[PDB]
Structure 1
Amino acid sequence: GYDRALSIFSPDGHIFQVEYALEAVKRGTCAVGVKGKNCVVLGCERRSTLKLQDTRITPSKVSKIDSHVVLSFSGLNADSRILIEKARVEAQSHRLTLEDPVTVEYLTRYVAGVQQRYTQSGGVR
């Protein structure tokens, strides 16, 4: 299998691949999250460079992970689908093994763990 270490330290102690991944996020459309006293609102930018778009079927920026948790993002769209799918599988896996839905913090910790894993595994970016 392809085992090449893509994410590695540089002389100044930086992992450039992780930092360049942040530049991809900088390029992505703006997403904002604001929590009130009894709610949370997720706002998302849609770049108007793309008209003639079918808004019914185009992937929405906010995704339900479970009936009580949502996920929005900024960066590579294709990358986000992999994290969303994994999160959704983990949410059902938790309900099945522990008989409670995930907490928001637990779900976050899982997704963040997947992202971390992809910064020190061989053959992946």
Structure 2
Amino acid sequence: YDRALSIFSPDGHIFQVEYALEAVKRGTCAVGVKGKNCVVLGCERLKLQDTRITSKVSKIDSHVVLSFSGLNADSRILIEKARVEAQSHRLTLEDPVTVEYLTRYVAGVQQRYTQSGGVRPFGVSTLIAGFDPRDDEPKLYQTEPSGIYSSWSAQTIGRNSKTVREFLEKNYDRKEPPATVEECVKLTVRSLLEVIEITVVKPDSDIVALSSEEINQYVTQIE
């Protein structure tokens, strides 16, 4: 039952699809936090590496962002397909892609690749964040190799996910979500220290990658 996608285990779940998730758990950690009007994405990062030609957070559009965990090679291709769809939708239609639409398409591609025994499903779980065009409601979504996409207030995928998804669960209150850029950033940083690069996306296609996070690290570390 383990060696095929088209075979159900006697207990009723496809093992091969599950095995793709453990590949994600082996990947680098990714984090995402939804503020009242902003979304923050944090990621887990040798001596001779060329750091000037490397960002684990790749933007699919001016207003949409996509982090990932798992096999980097698969992600680089899944990102490309999403980028083409974003422009194709912007071409066939006039409005930009809805955040829910992009994750639905990306999940469909992952789901599509599960529909044959001659194809390896993408061992990557995406963490899509952004704002709907002309909207101020932050939206964060997560996709899995199985093709299931979900909307999360805060999620972490990859290496050390359960430990980080437990820290967020107790420190993040759905009824008391952070209401400032600093507050969510501090939570994301504090989330990553339990084991730095931080990206902040704000409405109206205002995406900025933070620099000098040491201030938050120094502030959080003291507390």
Name the TM tier (shorter chain): 0.7 to 0.9
Contact 2:27 2:71 in 1 (8 A): yes
Contact 1:7 1:16 in 2 (8 A): no
Give every structure 1 segment of 4 or more consecutive aligned residues whose post-TM-superposition deviation is greater than 6 Å: none
Residue 120 of structure 1, CA deviation: 1.8
Cα distance per residue 1:72-123 (max 9 Å; x no partner): 0110000101110110000000000111110111001100111111112241
Deviates further, 4-13 or 28-37: 4-13
Alpha carbons of 1:56 and 1:89: their partners in 2 closer, same or farther (altered >3 Å)?
same
SS of the counterpart of 2:117?
Answer: coil
Contact 2:58 2:65 in 1 (8 A): yes
Contact 1:66 1:88 in 2 (8 A): yes
Instruction: Give percent identity, aligned residues only.
Output: 98
Contact 1:5 1:122 in 2 (8 A): yes
Residue 4 of structure 1, CA deviation: 11
Deviates further, 9-18 or 27-36: 9-18
Contact 1:65 1:91 in 2 (8 A): yes
Residues matched between the structures, number: 119
Gaps of 5+ in 2: 119-221
Cα distance per residue 1:41-63 (max 9 Å; x no partner): 11000xxxx332111112x2100
SS of the counterpart of 1:72?
Answer: strand
* Cα distance in 2 between the residues matched to 1:54 and 1:3: 40
Alpha carbons of 1:97 and 1:30: their partners in 2 closer, same or farther (altered >3 Å)?
same
Q: CA RMSD in A?
A: 6.7
Deviates further, 4-13 or 79-88: 4-13
* Cα distance in 2 between the residues matched to 1:55 and 1:62: 15
Q: TM-score, normalised by structure 2?
A: 0.49
Q: TM-score, normalised by structure 1?
A: 0.85
* Cα distance in 1 between the residues matched to 2:50 and 2:6: 38
Residue 10 of structure 1, CA deviation: 2.1
Q: Answer 1 or 2: which has greater strand percent.
A: 2
Contact 2:26 2:70 in 1 (8 A): yes
Residue 7 of structure 1, CA deviation: 4.6
* Cα distance in 1 between the residues matched to 2:2 and 2:26: 29
* Cα distance in 1 between the residues matched to 2:47 and 2:112: 37
Contact 2:32 2:42 in 1 (8 A): yes
Alpha carbons of 1:74 and 1:39: their partners in 2 closer, same or farther (altered >3 Å)?
same
User: Who is 1:53 aligned against?
Assistant: 49
SS of the counterpart of 1:71?
Answer: strand
1:20 aligns to 2:16 (yes or no)? no
SS of the counterpart of 1:34?
Answer: strand
Contact 1:31 1:42 in 2 (8 A): yes
Contact 1:83 1:111 in 2 (8 A): yes
